[PDB]
């Protein structure tokens, strides 16, 4: 029994030694030469209001115009960004919604929360009313993130240390990913859609192969829980935001910490992170009522989107990178550009 | 300016906004309560008597006041990641059994720690607590079997039901680190017929009166 623990410690030491050997050059040492990005001034082009409670998540449609936002009032609102109209207002059965997703094709929109159930809502329906398509029961902990892998199957992360891949037509989880030591709070599919990553309150991130069914790599370095994840657009790196007030860029191939973004004044955690289209800007929302735009290559704090009355809870950059929408607990989504 | 059907879209948005406002008002009229306490503390029995795979929601209607009681005991996951969802709840019902000396690994001390954690939570600085002390009928003799000194060496002065219960009440009420911002309303259920619902209504209406009183500057 104890011999197995010794073997695990030896394997951890071997991994640590290999990663340290691979660290032949810090990212800052090589990215210092490039010209820094100047202060990024962004104005709230639109203010999407109508929610009566905290915004807990939002997602951009693949067309870069429609965006769905979820809040504790028990409503999913599908805003048209270019005009701020309510295309749809889906009333939820359980108002404790902690995440939402917009299907890549735009037909379906999913959301989940403390009910432990991921509900799929069909938008392009003949009857004209958004009716729930399915309820993917099977989890034992609150749902913290949903992302449509396809119109047929999706992937869900829960607070019971498990992640899952569900088939929507069958309504049962085709794959179950296990290995986390604590609650899983965030999830983000890869650009190629074959791999994804999940960050957990065990202060670690996991890279999962969807089809294989088992993790490939584990990334450590955070001091506290991870609340947000996003894939670098190239698909070969991802940035994690945690409660220890530090964002961190990890590289899959190098399999180690690449950079850390933090500031002494910044003492609270990160609720959501997202990249820019070129990957040169990393926008992270903080508990301190405002979001910060970081030069992802030089780590310099490039800008501040301080416009929210309460905690910023979610944010997302369109597919074309035209605008970044941020939603906070003061119930207003604002689109900066 | 707007096209023939852009105006139609704007009209649809305005109608959706009207529906959203109506639903928001209806939801604001409702009272919300968060239910906490150990499963063996009679919480299930309390909700059953008062009601006349994750979060559970119960709906009551007493004296024209709609109560939404969120029983979240089934969420056997990490707290501090979903507790802030209930930041705006108007009260925290907190059940505890007066006979919690049984499961010695003591459970009275564990309930005390839980109450200390919940009362002083930064999310519940304003949210008041409605403390329920259950198992009075059998506690009245369990106290006779063994004195409170087995749990609190200080214990009740005279080992008696009344004095011991008052001591337990005081012990749990002094855990409130913010006397000004909260009022811990305590009740001894004793498996009463319907006094639980009436007491919840009284505590809730008092909390509402004081919330309005604070909003309009009188308090």
């Amino acid at each position, epitope marked *: 029994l104890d011999q197995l623990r010794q073997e695990a410690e030896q394997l951890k030491n071997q991994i640590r030694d290999a990663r340290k050997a691979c660290a032949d050059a810090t990212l800052s040492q090589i990215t210092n030469n490039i010209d820094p990005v100047g202060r990024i001034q962004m104005r709230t082009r639109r203010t999407l209001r109508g929610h009566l409670a905290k915004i807990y998540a939002m997602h951009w449609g693949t067309d870069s115009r429609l965006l769905v936002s979820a809040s504790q009032d028990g409503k999913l609102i599908i805003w048209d960004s270019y005009t701020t109209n309510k295309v749809h207002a889906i009333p939820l059965r359980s108002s404790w919604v902690m995440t939402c997703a917009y299907a890549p094709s735009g037909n379906y929109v999913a959301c989940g929360g403390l009910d432990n159930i991921c509900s799929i809502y069909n938008l392009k329906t003949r009857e004209g009313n958004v009716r729930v398509s399915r309820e993917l029961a099977g989890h034992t902990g609150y749902l913290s993130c949903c992302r449509f892998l396809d119109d047929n199957q999706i992937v869900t992360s829960s607070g019971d240390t498990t992640c899952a891949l569900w088939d929507i037509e069958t309504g049962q989880q085709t794959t179950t990913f296990t290995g986390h030591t604590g609650d899983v709070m965030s999830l983000s599919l890869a650009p190629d859609t074959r791999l994804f990553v999940s960050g957990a309150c065990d202060a670690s991130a996991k890279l999962w192969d969807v089809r294989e069914g088992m993790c490939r790599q584990t990334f450590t370095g955070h001091e506290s829980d991870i609340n947000a994840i996003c894939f670098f657009p190239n698909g070969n790196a991802f940035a994690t935001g945690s409660d220890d007030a530090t964002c961190r860029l990890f590289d899959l191939r190098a399999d180690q910490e690449l950079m850390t973004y933090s500031h002494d004044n910044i003492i609270c955690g990160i609720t959501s992170v997202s990249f820019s289209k070129s990957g040169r800007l990393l926008l992270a929302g903080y508990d301190d009522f405002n979001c910060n735009v970081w030069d992802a290559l030089k780590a310099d704090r490039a800008g501040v989107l301080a416009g929210h009355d309460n905690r910023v809870s979610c944010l997302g950059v369109t597919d074309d990178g035209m605008a970044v929408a941020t939603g906070s607990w003061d119930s207003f989504l604002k689109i900066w550009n | 300016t707007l096209s023939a059907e852009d105006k139609a879209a704007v009209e649809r948005s305005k*109608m959706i906004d009207r529906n959203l406002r109506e639903d928001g008002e209806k939801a604001a009229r409702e009272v919300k309560l968060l239910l906490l306490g150990a499963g063996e503390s009679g919480k299930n029995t309390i909700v059953k008597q008062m009601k006349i795979t994750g979060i559970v929601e119960t709906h009551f209607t007493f004296k024209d006041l709609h109560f939404k009681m969120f029983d979240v005991g089934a969420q056997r996951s990490e707290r501090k990641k979903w507790i802030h969802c209930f930041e705006g709840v108007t009260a925290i019902i907190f059940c505890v059994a007066l006979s919690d000396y049984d499961l010695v690994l003591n459970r009275m001390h564990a309930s005390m720690k839980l109450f200390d954690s919940i009362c002083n939570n930064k999310w519940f600085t304003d949210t008041s607590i409605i403390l329920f002390l259950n198992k009075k009928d059998l506690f009245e003799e369990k106290i006779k079997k063994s004195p409170l000194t087995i749990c609190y060496p200080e214990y009740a002065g005279s080992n008696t039901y009344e004095e011991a219960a008052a001591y337990i009440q005081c012990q749990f009420e002094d855990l409130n680190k913010r006397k000004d911002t909260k009022e811990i309303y305590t009740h001894f259920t004793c498996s009463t017929d319907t006094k639980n619902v009436q007491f919840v209504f009284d505590a809730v209406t008092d909390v509402i009166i004081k919330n309005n009183l604070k909003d309009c500057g009188l308090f």
Partner: single-chain antibody
Amino acid sequence: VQLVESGGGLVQPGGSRKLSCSASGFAFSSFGMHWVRQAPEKGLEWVAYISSGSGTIYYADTVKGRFTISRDDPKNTLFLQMTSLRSEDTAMYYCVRSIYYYGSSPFDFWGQGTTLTVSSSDIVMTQATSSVPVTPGESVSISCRSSKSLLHSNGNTYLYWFLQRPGQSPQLLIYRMSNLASGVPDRFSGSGSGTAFTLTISRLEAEDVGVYYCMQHLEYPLTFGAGTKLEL
């Protein structure tokens, strides 16, 4: 999804009649509705429009102040009250559906039609040919022209193409002049620019023969084309 309708029949000139349109199988309360007429042997002609919630109403100038459009959501019904009817009002009336939100498909579903026999600034739109001979398996194009460009500033060319097969109510084929209505065989394609639009059919086969109608929804009234017939 279904829209039955009744109330038509023989009415002497100067009388009145209330056409009723009973809707079932869809969310009526959220759908704006139209009444569209078609003469006994001529093309379509828009009659009236009522938005969801009855907050907006429009009438064709030839019935303004004579026809009143109403809607009762609780019973899911639509009403057209006509008074002082004339010989020009004899036609088949169709209860037409329409939902307006970004990316919607207005005029998707049409009623079965109710006939009405009476005892004895607008954007002009035209179609090149009234009747075209076609051969199955061939590719055929239909051309249409508008008086003024239909390309609004936002970029939506508000042109619509409808198909009316013999003895059947017209069904939407194309909306916005490029988007393809759901359920069509996918052979049809819409293209063109302001004042000149076209509908192309590749690999023509059965069920295509019929009258094609063009329409615009840039400004009211919604002027229809004269109709182009494809016959064997």
